[PDB]
Design a protein around this ligand. Structure first.
Ligand SMILES: Nc1ncnc2c1ncn2[C@@H]1O[C@H](COP(=O)(O)OP(=O)(O)OP(=O)(O)O)[C@@H](O)[C@H]1O
Ligand SMILES: Nc1ncnc2c1ncn2[C@@H]1O[C@H](COP(=O)(O)OP(=O)(O)OP(=O)(O)O)[C@@H](O)[C@H]1O
Ligand SMILES: Nc1ncnc2c1ncn2[C@@H]1O[C@H](COP(=O)(O)OP(=O)(O)OP(=O)(O)O)[C@@H](O)[C@H]1O
Ligand SMILES: Nc1ncnc2c1ncn2[C@@H]1O[C@H](COP(=O)(O)OP(=O)(O)OP(=O)(O)O)[C@@H](O)[C@H]1O
Ligand SMILES: Nc1ncnc2c1ncn2[C@@H]1O[C@H](COP(=O)(O)OP(=O)(O)OP(=O)(O)O)[C@@H](O)[C@H]1O
Lengths: 362, 362, 362, 362, 362
DNA sequence: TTTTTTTT
């Protein structure tokens, strides 16, 4: 005859929600009967229909409470506490294990009985992506190994090119894949003091196509970032600890995470060059767009920005044993359906419709 | 007995109120008898007279409680929470369809028994507005589609032309028809990052005054607008989610909305030009001013500015199937109602007067 | 026994008070017996002596309470809430009608039994100010109409002229009449952003001595205001709902009020001038100064710059039907009073003394 | 039947937790059945499996409670209170003796049944560090006693050597062993004071990379460092208290702690030279870079940066009497353990392997 | 039973503790039995062992409070309130008498039977300082009287002479004796406004090492602070009250405190020279330098820095009558104690050794 | 937390 605060907490755990208003807004829906709830009937959203019928009576009494935001705040605190625990006890390999499970859990629905997606679209996706550079699957598996291990110095690859050279949209799917974020390294000095606080608890950090002053001799806007890598001595090795701030109040001490440098094709000297111990580059190879613009759903669905395509790329082109061991059955359970549905010729079809700039579908 | 907090929550939901002071003011009105209420007799506000009798009982107890702003805070939090659920979960088309239901429910009132305006004059508004630029109902439908599918790069159009060319009059009606928001461009980014924060969930946003180059002949300056938009070279398209600031609440990393930029005439970099998947050209038509000069209620009652007038245009022009798929019974009902009083000959009699710069009314 | 919170709230409505400290200070005074209250017996302040005897009974029990500031806080919210509902729902005619009722209430008090100033003196002010310009009375009415209708791009009047042309003297009386506020755009361009925020929910605004540049050719200092108004163009014509700022607060979004600009004879780009309705150029005249010299009681009582003096003039110069229907009864009452109080020989003697540069009384 | 706040307070004390979320999260884990607990079974995290049983019943009741965060804030404040009492009351020698127990605890975990570490690899790092400077153990012992006594003027050590000559490494190891912080002083002269706000209540500081001037004749980029130090004699002499700029807060007043200075081979004023107790020169050596080049696990596991290696070195070389009388017991235990785990030939060969520049292990 | 908040407030008063965490931490220690308390047994900390037995019974119940930080805040605010009362009422003479009573209590502990110090080593310091300036004891007594009478214009003292002439040593001893703060006026003109806020409610201030202009002709590095002191006239003169500010606070108005100024041999404008009462020249004395190294326990223990040392000099040299009346009783007992410990021959032997340049103890 | 501070 009172609200059970624990049931709300369990719902917050099961959803892994951490926004007090989202939690409140969704949980109130359960006060009407699940039996008539159009959302329950039409199978619209997992985070509703999976739970409505369970939480129903408590949601009704919840709708009569007077403390509603208070309950919700404690629930949000539970999930933030859980995250804080995990972020300090575990190591990067378990983190990755879980993060992949999450993506796989999603694919398990998207292409599942909802019919809400056909994976073939993403197959055309991976086919485009694979042609970005040789064995992109292997380039990624190698990058994964690196920034899992977070070994000293071996912590920063690079992407070069001119502008409009894919290195941003590539980084997007990798930032997605990791839970990383990026740097406006060109900022002015006191802004530059406190951009850095983004790095708090981040898996990776990325340099946003850093700019050389006088690069306008190459029509490159002559921003500050490459000079600023002079001051940024040690963060790329990450072998001494630092403090961090977002201005005035948001502060903590940590090691500076690894990640990826990128630049447009300014010059770079040894003192800065070696700081990103590894390098790669890409450039516009317009037929690839000619496929996309004849495969437009790839971009309408921004698939070439999404990390789930990278996971799918890795799934087919990585041997099942290469994975973390515990999950590896799920890898088989997906490998099965790629084995079922695709000949490697049909994989190649897409990759070379791509390589022609021809629309993959035919 | 006691104040039902639930009943207040309902009234806030019903009204979709989200300012705590407005809500408190509204609810306290009901504490007198609805039986005698002048505002009810006057039929002055729907948000009052529809509800006064229903809530009178609970308003009586509400008036005595020593805790009133706590009730109203929780109610306002409920409405904010509702908006946040939808922010994530709705299709863009459903969002737009809700916006239309709201507008149509006002047109019920204005042109209803309240007599508070006459759609005669608003359809003269349609006549005036349809004279602005060709096929205007059709051009609007193209903009709506581009915004609903929200496809990469296919996200922004530019309005360009001299002063008193209505480019902003049009932009204003489009913001209303969506519920969009507006932004400046002529600042250093540091503060403007917070102004951009207004976008933190908006279907549509608009920028004005590129402050482009050239212009010294046109009586126009160059400055930070054109400096800034090209500097964040993708951000307007927003291929990638990016962090965004609001006071007290978290900084939000999200896709930036689609919409419009408008300018008096300057050069446009081909880079920036390529983000504008359309540009549309505006000019004076002094006879339209003369029609307005002979049709001044078109500005006094702000009809020429209203998204309502664009919605009216789309009603009396577009075929019923082009709409969203649930609401079409509304669309049919208004199309029928219109020619209970209009004939296309009289609708052209307005277009007649308009094109001559003659006053619409006879 | 117990404090009645509603009786406190009624007094805040009755007084239209909205500072917590002012409200608290007022109500505490009711604790002593009105039966002896020296303020009552001297009839000093109406907001006291009108109410003391009613509120005394509740004030005694309030005087003991431990909650006091919270009782006051809820009341101040109730008044601020009433203002928001009103500002969102009344027409500008009704708002202005309310303003006149408040001013007329003060006038009844001033010339009541306390009688603390003489109507003879205030009419010298009326004579003095109708003297200041041709058809002064009618120009005032024309401004009020414009503020009431708030016709877009017909929203601002320019007062231009040297120092001691009286433009602030006129503008101050206009501002007291409509209850606007004053702003200073002669600022660093960012400071405008908080500064212009004071217009939130105001009826009218004035900008003071908006500086151009190069005016030292005619001994004027040079400055920013004009160029800042060029930046502010959107706010001026009242096209669309811009938004406004406060410390520790989210923005509020609305049309920006109509208003006055005062200026020395800088140059103006007609691009800007074209956006006024109308202008008045102010031209100093000797006899006014001699008149004031011998009429010192005018300035000490601040008469010539008070909106009370303007209201008196309209009661004199205008026909009854020009005012709104509700107040016309009070208008008739005030016209009736004046006609007992004066003869045109008296008022003509005043204007003759003013023309003759005498002290106004003889 | 009710939550014991005292039991949470014990846990917070025993685990020395000072983050309310870390505390909240881990305590919540205890609600699930201890008898089955996989974390306990896998003996994974000491802070769990040592405690889960004792706290279980109270943790279950805590899971219901409506007030969880308040309990945790009280608990955390109790821990912070302990740090303040200890900070103000202990001798420097006791503070060090605490840090030793804290690290020895962690070693008992690592090389215990948890098996998370291999003591042989850790002994390999000790040899490489020991070869970095002659008589390294006695150098380190001298340094520690110097910090413990903190005899004024006799307070600072100077590390000179070319880049990639290890001076950053050794500083980092020392700083981890003692818990100080580090400072940049190539800043311009003003905000040095805000920088020095860092030092408040720290045990050590390190001045990294102090730029001289004219060193650019040897490509050493010139800057503010040296001449900033030549001001600061009083801070370095440690003779009397100084004041430090915390941002947003008042200055606070204390003895400025001892520390380490590092540089490439800039020239130094005699005035500054005289403040150091002792200079250590560092030089790059081929066999070391070659040995590191082979012995990858050292760097992957960041062995040579970590203070655990220094403690192992002290234990391996130095008599029990040299350690604080209390913890000598743990020293004796660790001596016996290490002796059993390493016959001298093992260590001697490993050190000889370092000398060859081959991998340390054969 | 329930917590006595009164007993906490008494403890906070008697320890004069005004840090909430320190108060909390100290009180918590008492919760264990005083009978066995090792801190009591070893008499390590007076604020514990004097109090543990008294407060024990309440410490237990406090340890069960769910309200602990509130009890502490109320107690701590009682300590803060008493200081505001005192500063706004006490005579400067009584302030000094309080300050001596505090110092005399430390000396009772410090040379107490458990104390670490010995009176002989400290008296060696007194002999050395009496050599530092002719008539040293009288100079101190003159300075103290001047601070107590605080006579306008007749307020400020100048210490002048080359680096390593002991002026900071003497200043620090004086500053401990009286209480006060350092300040640094070498800043640029604006930040001074916060610097000077440090003076708020202080008894003394000391201006560190003000730098002049052109002294590099004598190697003296130039700076702003001399010219700033030109423009601090009313602060120095103390004739009228002034306004002071901190961060994040509104200005505070008071008489600016008296104090000391320290500098190298820059030339002083005759104007500023006129504001000082007294100039004292400090010059190097190599025979002190030779002595000091032979007497290093003075530096090691910071004896020559301390107000404690000065008070021994005063107690030695000056008549009992000269001290403030109440503490004369305590003072007599210290003179008696000192006379027991040293015959004048001991003192003579020491002081002779200093003058010889010989270790102060033969 | 933002605003003032911090910064420039
Ligand atoms: N290999 C490629 N084939 C086809 N198009 C490409 C290729 N590389 C880049 N492009 C074009 O570049 C566009 C933008 O790429 P991206 O956002 O990654 O740029 P970027 O190199 O990171 O640029 P910037 O340095 O300016 O931020 C893509 O949408 C695509 O049109
Ligand atoms: N196509 C048009 N032909 C003639 N007059 C027009 C036209 N469109 C707008 N007007 C006139 O322009 C006046 C101002 O319109 P509006 O503010 O929309 O102009 P704008 O050119 O879009 O402005 P801005 O310079 O701010 O971009 C209207 O009141 C109307 O009289
Ligand atoms: N038209 C006038 N002719 C002569 N004297 C005037 C006139 N108007 C005002 N005065 C005198 O000048 C004084 C100042 O008037 P007011 O401040 O309104 O003038 P202003 O032109 O608006 O000045 P400013 O630009 O300095 O604000 C009045 O108090 C009165 O004494
Ligand atoms: N004595 C040495 N001989 C050769 N290589 C060395 C030596 N000491 C360190 N190294 C290499 O130099 C790298 C960096 O070491 P470290 O940062 O301690 O040097 P540093 O002289 O302080 O450098 P810097 O002044 O550039 O920061 C080490 O990780 C190791 O690879
Ligand atoms: N009269 C003196 N003659 C020689 N050496 C002295 C003398 N007085 C002090 N010293 C030495 O100078 C050291 C520093 O003393 P102190 O800080 O008081 O000097 P200072 O001249 O006031 O310095 P600063 O101006 O740098 O603050 C002392 O510890 C002592 O070793």
């Amino acid at each position: 005859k009172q609200v059970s605060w624990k049931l709300v907490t369990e719902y917050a755990m099961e959803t892994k929600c951490d926004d007090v208003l989202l939690l409140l807004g969704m949980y109130l829906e359960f006060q009407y009967s699940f039996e008539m709830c159009l959302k329950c009937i039409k199978k619209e959203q997992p985070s509703h229909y999976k739970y409505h019928e369970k939480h129903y009576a408590n949601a009704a009494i919840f709708a009569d409470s007077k403390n509603q935001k208070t309950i919700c705040q404690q629930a949000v605190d539970t999930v933030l506490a859980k995250k804080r625990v995990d972020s300090l006890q575990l190591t990067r390999e378990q983190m990755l294990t879980n993060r992949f499970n999450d993506l796989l859990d999603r694919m398990d629905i998207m292409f599942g009985s909802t019919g809400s997606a056909d994976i073939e679209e993403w197959m055309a996706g991976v086919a485009w992506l694979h042609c970005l550079l040789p064995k992109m699957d292997s380039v990624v598996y190698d990058f994964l190994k690196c920034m899992v291990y977070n070994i000293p110095k071996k912590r920063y690859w690079l992407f070069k090119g001119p502008i409009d050279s894919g290195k941003t949209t590539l980084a997007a799917a990798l930032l997605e894949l990791c839970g990383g974020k990026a740097l406006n390294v060109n900022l002015p000095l006191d802004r530059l003091n406190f951009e850095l606080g983004v790095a708090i608890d981040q898996f990776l950090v990325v340099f946003e196509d850093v700019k050389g002053t006088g690069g306008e001799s190459r029509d490159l806007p002559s921003g500050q970032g490459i000079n600023n890598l002079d001051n940024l001595r040690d963060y790329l090795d990450g072998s001494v600890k630092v403090n961090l701030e977002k201005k005035h109040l948001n502060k903590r001490t940590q090691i500076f995470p690894p990640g990826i440098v990128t630049m447009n094709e300014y010059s770079v000297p040894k003192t800065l060059q070696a700081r990103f111990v590894k390098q790669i580059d890409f450039r516009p190879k317009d037929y690839l767009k000619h496929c996309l613009e004849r495969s437009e759903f790839l971009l309408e669905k921004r698939i070439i920005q999404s990390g789930i395509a990278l996971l799918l790329m890795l799934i087919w082109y990585r041997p099942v044993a290469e994975f973390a061991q515990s999950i590896q059955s799920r890898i088989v359970e997906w490998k099965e359906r790629l084995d079922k549905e695709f000949s490697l010729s049909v994989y190649q079809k897409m990759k070379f419709n791509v390589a022609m700039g021809i629309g993959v579908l035919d």
